[PDB]
A paper describes a structure:
Noroviruses are highly contagious, infecting both humans and animals. The human norovirus capsid protruding (P) domain binds histo-blood group antigen (HBGA) co-factors for infection, and a recently discovered bat norovirus (GX) was also found to interact with HBGAs. In this study, we determined the P domain structures of four human noroviruses and one bat norovirus using X-ray crystallography to examine structural features linked to potential interspecies transmission.
The P domains of GII.9 (AY038599), GII.23 (KT290889), GII.27 (MG495077), GVIII (AJ844470), and GX (MF373609) were expressed in E.coli. Also, these residue side chains were properly positioned to bind the fucose moiety of HBGAs (structure not shown). These two equivalent residues were lacking in the GVIII and GX P domains; however, an aspartic acid (D367) was located nearby in the GX P domain. Fc-NB26 bound to the GVIII P domain at weaker concentrations than these GII genotypes, while Fc-NB26 did not bind to the GX P domain at any concentration tested.
Numbering used by the authors:
A (entry chain A), B (entry chain A): 223 to 295, 311 to 542
Write the structure that this text describes.
């Protein structure tokens, strides 16, 4: 009677990143990527329990929303936001959720626009959200500021506004595998999705990869990838099906879309991430799909990739 | 043995528009909206056959892509593109597809950015795509131009570039329910998704609604909605399941998410759109989900909304 667990029958090439609105360009396993992952977006259990700051669908990944504050709690001045969820429902600060759902889970100067909502006249202008700064990016406290030199005259106390990202600036310190300090100078622990980590020596996380759009001054080049543990279409699939997990870990096979050949197998863990048996950096082109084959015991040994 | 037809068990409030990257804010039936719909995005049959320019997932809705042409086939100069699909595979012009998949299917000055791809150094800058212009927007011919005053020095012949939209300018003539002229001055008919139209007097199309972001000079106000026939998550669901249709038309019920009460019923047509029995403008808040109940004969009479 219980809903069987399944994966979406879609090639990875047709999926999108769960941490930024981008297509998946492939997968990577690498001993020089972080051995454990702590992302807060793209986190769901296999039986459909959202974790961290993860949205169920791609409504507003990377966005923050709220109402304009005329006072704090080229020259770029802060635009302060009394934060809401991106669907404009209330966000309770200092509670059991690190930030509103969909809030960026990386540290960067994020470029984008600030959108005045239709009730106050649809308009938008350029702004950035610098998630490296404790003073203006502490969303766990219920407030955050974007920065803009284009806001003059367009906002008044209480206006609904939403930040929509286009990309980042990237420098020598950019590392998108580090979480921001959601509480600013104040530590936060409650409601974080836990570390995803293999428990088999010889297994590594299989990450899904996208290219992050970058706009540095004068076009300075520092190309940057962004990883996630689950493409958003897998998050939505597990959320929608709510299939009970019926074993320690899910055995999955990656199937070539053209030939139907089994390319490799992996473990899909209940906490929502993939591991494979590998020792060296391996790049997987996304012209295949994952197929759930069976629930297996935690001591199952994967065929080496 | 055949896959049963189903709808995604998600409230409409968690779905996104199939014609622009936006959340669905509700549904509308209205005798003063077009009685037939001709959108090319968000078109799929119930058994999973994509139509028009419709992508299976939200990879690149509203984008166009290609390689830079240094020659034609503030002051804003055209940036000419030898068009590809947005996944960088080849687009065959003058054939059986009106434009690359995901190409905008409305006429507007679409604001956004132009993205130089990582192989030539990740960088992006502001640009617009004016889909009202025959001379620079004829994607059926394999070429189109965006316009920019920020490109100087950043592009060379053959560079991969992608236009990503943020919103539109809107004026007194804006009407997003009219298709662009995909062939420019040359008519195009081949490969268009057909008109969606009720076949019951007393029934009207149930449209899904989003608010389009607008940026007019000086913040001039002209708020604009954009309609679609299917949210993209329904498109993806039907595409993924490939469920055979087992009757003339699908009977669906809209269920209140809180109470589980049946709010109204409608017909979900094989060509991929909803109709309901109504006479006057009716606005539906999206805090419910559609449930497939049975295949019915084409002469089935719906309970009035
Ligand atoms: Cl499966
Ligand atoms: Cl259903």
């Amino acid at each position: 009677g219980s809903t069987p667990f399944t994966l979406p029958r879609l090639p990875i090439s047709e999926m999108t990143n769960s941490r930024f609105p981008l297509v998946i360009k492939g997968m990577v396993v690498d001993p020089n990527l972080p051995l454990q992952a702590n992302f807060q977006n793209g986190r769901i259990t296999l039986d459909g329990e959202l974790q961290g700051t993860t949205l169920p669908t791609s409504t507003s990944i990377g966005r923050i929303s709220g109402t304009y504050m005329s006072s704090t709690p080229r020259v770029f001045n802060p635009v302060w936001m009394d934060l809401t969820e991106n669907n404009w429902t209330e966000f309770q600060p200092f509670n059991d959720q690190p930030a509103p759902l969909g809030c960026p889970d990386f540290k960067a100067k994020i470029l984008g626009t600030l959108i005045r909502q239709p009730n106050n006249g649809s308009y938008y202008f350029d702004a950035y959200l610098d998630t490296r700064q404790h003073g203006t990016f502490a969303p766990y406290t219920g407030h955050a500021a974007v920065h803009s030199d284009q806001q003059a005259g367009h906002l008044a106390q209480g206006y609904k506004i939403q930040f929509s990202p286009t990309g980042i600036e990237s420098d020598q310190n950019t590392d998108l595998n580090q979480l921001p300090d959601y509480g600013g100078a104040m530590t936060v622990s409650k409601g974080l999705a836990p570390a995803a980590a293999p428990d088999f020596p010889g297994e590594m996380i299989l990450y899904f990869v996208s290219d992050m759009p970058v706009r540095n001054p004068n076009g300075e080049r520092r190309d940057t990838e962004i990883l996630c543990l689950l493409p958003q279409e897998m998050v939505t699939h597990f959320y929608e099906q709510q299939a009970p997990s019926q074993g320690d870990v899910a055995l999955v096979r990656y199937i070539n879309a053209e030939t139907g050949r089994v390319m490799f197998e992996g473990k899909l863990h209940r906490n929502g991430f993939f591991t494979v048996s590998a020792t060296a950096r391996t790049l997987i082109v996304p012209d295949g799909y994952f197929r759930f084959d069976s629930w297996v015991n935690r001591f199952y040994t994967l065929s080496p990739m």
